[PDB]
Amino acid sequence: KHEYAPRFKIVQKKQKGRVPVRTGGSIKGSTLQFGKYGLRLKSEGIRISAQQLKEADNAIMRYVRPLNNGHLWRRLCTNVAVCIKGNETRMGKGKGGFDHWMVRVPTGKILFEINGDDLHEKVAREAFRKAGTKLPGVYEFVSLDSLVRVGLHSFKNPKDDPVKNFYDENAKKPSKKYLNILKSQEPQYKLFRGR
């Protein structure tokens, strides 16, 4: 509903920033969560405007609405407010009036997701290709068995990466603050703190 037009109470101008190249191997929003088939970015990290996203959504919908129990999950919201000073002004007196909303999209991230009752995969693939024709990146069809993109030419299965109880790890190799707290909890300090 509000993914292409956030309702920040205090509307305000924003700096340009940069699209996060996720050097640490994030895989956040790079996985199929809601649907069966999806459309992910394949190229370098890119900014997608609100209008472009809307058009992609519309393109996808043409295939989704005919389906029985058809659904489209829009995975990303255009949260960054872009201002643009007109291409007609001498220079930076002041800044720029609000123009459009935009989203910073990392390399591996999923944009859309679909799942119908009577949805064959070929149709879904076609729809997602047609959606990609309207967006500024280069995109890729992603199924539930197809594995998570991280880099431009690199891949990963989330099933593989290890599970860890971090409290236990902390206890094993404790910080100074934690040790101080533990000492405080002990009786030769707790009795004589005198509050």
């Binding site: 007196k93 603050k177 101080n180 707290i181 030769q188 300090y189 004589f192 703190r193």
Partner: protein, 113 residues
């Protein structure tokens, strides 16, 4: 068009005397806006919560078992000591005076109430 071209020269506000360092009575161990760092052994805290030197020693940023979730910045009177001082023990103390060995000096100090 109104230009928000105004801002304030930032306030130099950080540690000014680091660990193991040798201070002197009355020096600024850490300007800060807030009691981010609380006065600790042998140190004093000023109006702005600035922390200053009370005894000439060695600054030591140390946590404290008694006061948890806090961080102090004291100044042991000597390096050998560890400012997270024990507790149930004598407290290091410094006399700080030179006995007037001069007859005249001693006389003046005494004779004078």
């Amino acid at each position: 068009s109104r230009t928000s071209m105004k801002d304030s020269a930032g306030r130099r506000l950080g540690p000014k005397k680091y660990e193991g360092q040798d201070v002197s009575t009355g020096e600024i161990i850490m300007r800060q806006r807030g009691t981010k760092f609380y006065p600790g052994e042998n140190v004093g805290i000023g109006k702005d919560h600035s922390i200053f030197a009370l005894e000439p020693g060695v600054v030591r940023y140390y946590l404290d078992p008694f006061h948890p979730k806090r961080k102090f910045i004291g100044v042991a009177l000597r390096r050998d000591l560890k400012l997270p001082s024990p507790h149930f023990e004598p407290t290091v103390r410094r006399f700080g005076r030179f006995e007037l060995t001069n007859k005249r000096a001693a006389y003046k100090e005494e004779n004078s109430i």
